[PDB]
């Protein structure tokens, strides 16, 4: 059901926020989120001091981008068109059959 898929999504989000990538490769290992993003900067070749010195700015940028995502989806419903396309196609087929 939609609620069960929502619970899977919530579990994935909680694991990513609280444990980083540890929960995917084994037991979930607790870690502060700034240290997780420090590892993630270290992966892309940027030292963790860049995150720690610019923590507030990065948090503000992430919050602004996340807030803008909802407006971006709302302004253009065509972003979901692919999903809608699927539904439309199925309906069309059945209608043709009838």
């Amino acid at each position: 059901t939609d609620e069960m898929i929502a619970q899977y999504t919530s579990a994935l989000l909680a694991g990513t926020i609280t444990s980083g990538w540890t929960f995917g490769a084994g037991p979930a290992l607790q870690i502060p989120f700034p240290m997780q993003m420090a590892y993630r900067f270290n992966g892309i070749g940027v030292t963790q001091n860049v995150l720690y010195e610019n923590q507030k700015l990065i948090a503000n940028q992430f919050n602004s981008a996340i807030g803008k995502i909802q407006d971006s989806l709302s302004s253009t419903p065509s972003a979901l068109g692919k999903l809608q396309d699927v539904v439309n196609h199925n309906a069309q087929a059945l209608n043709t059959l009838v």
């Binding site: 502060p32 240290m35 963790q48 720690y52 923590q55």
Partner: protein, 78 residues
Amino acid sequence: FLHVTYVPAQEKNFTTAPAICHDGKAHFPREGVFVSNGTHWFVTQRNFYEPQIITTDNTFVSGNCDVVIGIVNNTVYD
């Protein structure tokens, strides 16, 4: 396909800090993270627990102490 993989086990919790404040300078681990067993601070690799004394070889300074959030006071050995 027989996939041989490494799975962590026997987890233990520790107190961690982003950086160590020594003589007016922040210190970040070159590889690994800073952990505490209750009274002493060590540096360990992320995926396995082998604590080591925080020295200048495994740390780089790169900054000052006031800007970093969560910094803690400890000695960095030379």
